[PDB]
Amino acid sequence: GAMEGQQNLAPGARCGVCGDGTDVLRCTHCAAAFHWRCHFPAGTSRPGTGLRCRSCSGDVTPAPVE
Ligand SMILES: [Zn+2]
Ligand SMILES: [Zn+2]
């Protein structure tokens, strides 16, 4: 219906900065739960192409495919 996301509170996965897991973002390269602004408060823009946590955003160098 419209209440399948009622328990959006990930088990053992919440924004450590807030304590809440309400509308918490997930990492695509690993498993994580955080709010973008809570991890990247430097004015970093949230990418729609691959949500990346702090660790996964450390080294991001793609392989030049020709
Ligand atoms: Zn937060
Ligand atoms: Zn990650």
Side-chain angles (χ1 to χ4, degrees), residues 11-64:
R14 291 183 171 210
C15 176
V17 181
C18 294
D20 287 281
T22 306
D23 284 277
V24 81
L25 296 175
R26 305 305 201 287
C27 197
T28 52
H29 285 267
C30 82
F34 65 99
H35 306 138
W36 183 258
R37 302 182 65 203
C38 305
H39 260 229
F40 296 85
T44 318
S45 47
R46 171 175 53 155
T49 39
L51 209 297
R52 283 159 278 163
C53 72
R54 174 62 67 175
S55 188
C56 296
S57 300
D59 285 89
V60 188
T61 308

